Amino acid sequence: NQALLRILKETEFKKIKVLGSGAFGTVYKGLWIPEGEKVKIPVAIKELREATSKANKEILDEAYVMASVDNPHVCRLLGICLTSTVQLIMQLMPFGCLLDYVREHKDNIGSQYLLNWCVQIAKGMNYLEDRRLVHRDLAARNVLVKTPQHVKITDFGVPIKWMALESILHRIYTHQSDVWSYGVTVWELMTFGSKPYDGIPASEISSILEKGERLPQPPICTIDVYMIMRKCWMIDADSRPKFRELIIEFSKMARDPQRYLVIQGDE
Ligand SMILES: *CCC(=O)Nc1cc(-c2c[nH]c3ncnc(Nc4ccc(CN5C(=O)c6ccccc6C5=O)cc4)c23)ccc1OCCO
């Protein structure tokens, strides 16, 4: 349905505070105040940087897809405002991005939380695959925390250190290159937000991968968890797991979390 996407008037939303900013734009915490309603809805508003040159119809075409996603672990576009800039409106995710959440809360994050996040991210990615949507930038920074045990993928619709080798070398992006990025994302979570290949120039990463080197086993990970991660980083894209398999395997591990992760204080 085109009814799934609200075209917002400028009076219908208000930017109140800054949530974050970067080269691509600024995200604000604000309020959606729909006309003819009696409510004020907390939202996040991303204002993209103004472009010197796509056409409004093509933008709306893409926005409709983002408004059509229907899965508890993928963000949905609630509204759009087209002016000199593109502004994207979606529900506020009050706990912020998962990367910063895990860094801030590391001393209080247990194994069942970690494995549940892995399940949820795999479910959202499997949904994108069912919709034939390749993400291209999955990373812990692009998972948002609605509540501590409800997360959602965002930032879809160059991150060399998350990229599959065939994306770096040949600009090939597929669901299987997203699986590589998923493995790096899991590595970020299991290290409580460490930086992959910290301090290594982006242009050196392909030679690391070519030589057969990979991100190291996080101390908390048992062999079965690290083996899943390593399988996501096979050179042969079709030898990597599928997201539907990752759901099954991490769901199994989340049923016995102390078997699969050994966290600070475990015996
Ligand atoms: C990890 C560092 C970080 O990202 N910080 C950071 C957090 C936020 C942030 C905090 N709470 C938020 N709630 C909701 N949304 C955002 N951010 C956000 C991201 C993307 C978009 C644009 N957008 C959509 O609207 C949409 C809809 C469907 C599918 C995909 C998308 C989509 O990508 C809007 C809002 C929250 C904001 C900014 C932050 O810092 C950024 C620079 O590090």
Side-chain angles (χ1 to χ4, degrees), residues 19-22 25-28 43-46 48 66-67 69 74-79 88-101 140-145 153-157:
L19 286 171
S21 73
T26 303
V27 184
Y28 304 84
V43 290
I45 301 144
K46 179 175 190 173
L48 297 188
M66 296 165 70
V69 289
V74 183
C75 294
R76 192 185 80 86
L77 185 63
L78 170 172
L88 308 174
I89 293 75
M90 65 170 193
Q91 294 285 336
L92 184 69
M93 302 288 272
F95 293 85
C97 71
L98 185 56
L99 174 64
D100 289 344
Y101 187 85
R141 62 174 176 277
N142 289 335
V143 180
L144 291 173
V145 182
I153 297 160
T154 194
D155 238 75
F156 64 92

Side-chain angles (χ1 to χ4, degrees), residues 211-226:
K211 188 192 335 184
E213 294 173 8
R214 297 294 186 272
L215 290 165
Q217 179 168 8
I220 68 173
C221 292
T222 59
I223 186 62
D224 291 347
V225 178
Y226 189 51

Side-chain angles (χ1 to χ4, degrees), residues 136-179:
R136 303 193 178 202
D137 193 14
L138 180 65
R141 62 174 176 277
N142 289 335
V143 180
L144 291 173
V145 182
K146 181 178 178 201
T147 63
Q149 285 287 269
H150 184 179
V151 303
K152 301 189 186 191
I153 297 160
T154 194
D155 238 75
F156 64 92
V158 348
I160 291 287
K161 292 180 180 178
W162 284 257
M163 280 164 66
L165 185 60
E166 70 269 15
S167 307
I168 300 171
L169 301 182
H170 305 297
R171 314 179 187 169
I172 293 170
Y173 299 84
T174 66
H175 304 294
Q176 292 311 103
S177 62
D178 280 345
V179 169

